[PDB]
Design a protein around this nucleic acid. Structure first.
Lengths: 28, 377, 60, 144
RNA sequence: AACUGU
RNA sequence: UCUCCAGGCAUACGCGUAUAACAACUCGGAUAACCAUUGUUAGUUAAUCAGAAUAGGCAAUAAUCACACUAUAAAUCACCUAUAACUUCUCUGUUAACCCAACACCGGAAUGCCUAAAGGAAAGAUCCAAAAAGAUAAAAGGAAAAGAA
């Protein structure tokens, strides 16, 4: 650049374990 | 019985310390080169790819770039410091300008573009020729002085370093090699050193420039060819010193084109870059002609003057060489710095009308008169 | 054994930094000290290596 | 009485010289078992040269040649030699380390100088006398 | 012919 | 950091991204490590380095430090006279450990500089078999030094 101008690139883009095998759904 | 061996790196090992001792051995050999010719031969016998530097260049901050490589400090203005009818010189110079421009008859150049450049060279040569004769009675030193017409100044030095990033030599550290070859329009060579413009070791707040980018990033191309350091004449020539250097800038770098290119501020930079390059390159060669090199830095500062003219404006430059050590090894222990003093370009005359030139400025002529009259003390 | 070598590398790294240069092997004895242990009179006349880690249980 | 090592007799000594220099600098080196055993004798004899005395001119020539780095020469006469004055031998401790997993399966060993400042190596321990068999042997010893 | 581990 | 080795650097030609960073560890390297493989992204900056008007007139005598000196092998547009034009810096090349030999070939490959300051590693590990190959050494002898026909 001329006129003493300067340029800098801008910063773009700155179940329970105890009961396993039984699904938690079961209450039985 | 104290016979302990020195604690040093083995020369034969493949390590940085071992290579350093091998590197030191070569550096020691250069110390042991007794004759000037032997010193030059050893330094320049191998050709390596090195930057080619143009004394006159259009690069932005070109003076700063050259100073960084050279460790030259450029103080604005002139360095701190027999009548000949100064009016008579104007009349004689007025005739000389009218002689080439209006009186001499010569075949016109075919190109039609060199006409302006050719005319500027003729008038400058004539003024110089008559000035030498008119100043000869006052200063007998000029009679014994040697005036060089468009002879080349050569200088070769290393500043900076770089690591090879790729190739068979990847990772090896390589110094940045440079060369300036300059052909001043005219220069005066004397057999006696000029009076020093400032004591050796002089230190000033103004600091040497340092370059952010590599020399390659700015247009500067490394080429492998002979390394040459030359004073404008062989070592056999008795005149191993000189008084002043005369430079004529080409049309491309002239003020008018530079202003059009918007590099008006760099007009002085072009003036500064050429002066610093020529004087340092030329001054360093003399010290080499005296046996001084980087590790044998000069015991006495090398001083001289230079004048650069754009055809109309005239600039005057003064350089003092304090350091021949720009290699890392020799520059490892040196408080000295190279000092350059330069004046801004000034017009020498206004216009040529009929057979009488108008507006001649004696002030620029006075500096030439002062330079011509100055002699070693 | 892997622990010993890893500690040795750490100890060696501290020694290298302390020496600060090649071919600087001391002519005097060397000792290693860990945090919580301070140089004593017995440690005088011996190179002292200071370790930020506390004295390892295995190391005595 | 010597292992056939190196491209020539000089190489073995130069390789031994390289091995000896490293061990003195660090005091504990890991290398192939065969090399460690071969160089163990040299290291012990070098300590004797240090014990002989610093003023001994012959020791300097041996030390200078064997130790490429000359900073170690003061160390040998002022660190290694004073350290081993009480000891009559066995200055070097060499132990077998598991073979390198570098596809060549080289036999590995670690050689160190005793009395060093480095952490103690994990040495093997004999069975305690509190063991049943040892206690039974203790009873037999007491009766006799 | 000598020369040498031919 | 140590031990040891000793043709290195530019341009031409050719090659055409093999360049570099990152990420991979399968395939490619005539086995791995490591990458030269795989993927991604970057790169090589030129008024200066390199590549990309006309019509007439009129020319005896080599070089060799060109002088002497001879020679035979026989070795040098310009400038004048006219005509015509009348203010320019773009385009293109620039990376690399690279090319021709089916190969990361062993050789082929123009020129300048210079000989280590540049450029490099013979040891996948262990054993110390025999036999085989190369090299060195020989008590006494000397074809069972280099001279003659």
């Amino acid at each position: 650049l001329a006129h003493g101008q300067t340029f800098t690139f801008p910063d773009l883009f700155p179940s329970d374990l105890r009961c396993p095998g039984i699904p938690s759904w079961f209450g039985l | 019985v104290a016979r302990y061996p020195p604690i040093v790196a083995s020369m034969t090992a493949d390590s940085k310390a071992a290579r350093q001792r091998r590197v030191q051995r070569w550096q020691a050999t250069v110390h042991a080169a007794p004759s000037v010719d032997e010193k030059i031969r050893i330094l320049t016998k191998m050709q390596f790819k090195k930057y080619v530097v143009h004394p006159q260049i259009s690069a932005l901050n070109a003076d700063r770039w050259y100073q960084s490589f050279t460790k030259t400090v450029f103080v604005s203005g002139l360095p701190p410091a027999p009548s000949l009818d100064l009016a008579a010189l104007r009349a004689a110079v007025c005739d000389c300008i009218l002689q080439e421009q209006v009186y001499v008859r010569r075949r016109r150049p075919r190109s039609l573009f060199d006409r302006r450049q050719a005319l500027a060279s003729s008038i400058l040569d004539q003024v110089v020729r008559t000035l030498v004769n008119l100043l000869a009675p006052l200063n007998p030193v000029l009679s014994t002085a040697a005036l060089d017409c468009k002879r080349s100044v050569d200088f070769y030095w290393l500043r900076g370093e770089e690591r090879i990033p790729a190739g068979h030599r990847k990772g090896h550290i390589d110094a940045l090699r440079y060369q300036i070859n300059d052909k001043p329009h005219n220069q005066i060579r004397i057999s006696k050193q000029l009076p020093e413009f400032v004591p050796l070791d002089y230190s000033i707040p103004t600091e040497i420039p340092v370059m952010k980018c590599k020399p390659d990033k700015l247009p500067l191309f490394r080429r492998q060819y002979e390394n040459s350091i030359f004073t404008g004449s062989k070592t056999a020539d008795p005149c191993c010193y000189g008084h002043t250097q005369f430079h004529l800038i080409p049309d491309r770098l002239k003020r008018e084109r530079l202003i059009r290119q918007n590099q008006a501020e760099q007009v002085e930079a072009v003036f500064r870059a050429n002066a610093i390059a020529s004087l340092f390159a030329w001054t360093g060669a003399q010290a080499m002609y005296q046996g001084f090199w980087s590790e044998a830095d000069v015991t006495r500062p090398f001083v001289s003057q230079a004048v650069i003219t754009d055809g109309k404006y005239f600039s005057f430059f003064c350089y003092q060489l304090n350091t021949l050590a720009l290699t890392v090894q020799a520059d490892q222990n040196n408080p000295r710095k190279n000092l350059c003093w330069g004046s801004q370009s000034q017009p020498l005359y206004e216009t040529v009308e009929d057979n009488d030139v108008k507006g001649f400025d004696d002030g620029t002529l006075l500096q030439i008169v002062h330079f011509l009259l100055n002699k070693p003390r | 054994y892997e622990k010993v070598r890893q500690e040795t590398t750490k100890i060696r790294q501290q020694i290298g930094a302390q020496e600060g240069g090649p071919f600087r092997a001391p002519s005097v004895e060397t000792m290693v000290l860990y945090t919580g242990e301070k140089p004593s009179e017995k440690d005088q006349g011996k190179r002292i290596v200071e370790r930020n880690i506390k004295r390892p249980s295995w190391f005595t | 009485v010597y292992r056939r090592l190196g491209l020539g007799p000089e190489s073995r000594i130069h390789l031994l010289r390289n091995l000896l220099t490293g061990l003195v600098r660090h005091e504990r080196i890991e290398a192939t078992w065969a090399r460690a055993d071969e160089m163990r004798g040299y290291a012990e004899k070098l300590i004797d040269y240090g014990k002989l005395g610093d003023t001994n001119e012959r020791a300097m020539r041996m030390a200078d040649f064997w130790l490429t780095e000359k900073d170690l020469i003061p160390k040998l006469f002022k660190v290694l030699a004073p350290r081993f004055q009480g000891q009559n031998g066995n200055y070097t401790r060499m132990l077998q380390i598991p073979n390198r997993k570098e596809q060549d399966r080289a036999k590995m060993a670690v050689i160190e100088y005793k009395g060093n400042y480095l952490p103690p190596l994990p040495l093997p321990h004999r069975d305690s006398n509190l063991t049943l068999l040892n206690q039974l042997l203790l009873g037999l010893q007491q009766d006799l």
